[PDB]
Amino acid sequence: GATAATFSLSFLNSMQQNTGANNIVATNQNGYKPGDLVSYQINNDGTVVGN
């Protein structure tokens, strides 16, 4: 019953210079399972932050 994944994949800065064999160099996305507070810390700008 969970929804799908609407991802706009972008292959920016891709080149074909006969660079040996095809391979990946960078990959990132913006999804995650929910997480629980493990630790926390304070930064000297004022803002606390939990990890």
Binding site: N13, M15, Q17, T19, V25, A26
Partner: protein, 51 residues
């Protein structure tokens, strides 16, 4: 170094200098100091001009 591949001291103070631009890239003194970074880009090729 760091995640952004910018030169930085032990505290978080980014290191700056003249950025190099062009192809072949070369320094220029007419640009203001910029945060130096060692990129992860794949250097482009160049056609043969003589032999």
């Amino acid at each position: 170094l760091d995640e952004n591949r910018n030169l930085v001291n032990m505290q978080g103070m980014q290191l700056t200098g003249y950025p190099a631009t062009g192809t072949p890239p070369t320094i220029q003194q007419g640009a203001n100091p910029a945060p130096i970074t060692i990129p992860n880009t794949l250097m482009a090729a160049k056609s043969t001009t003589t032999a």
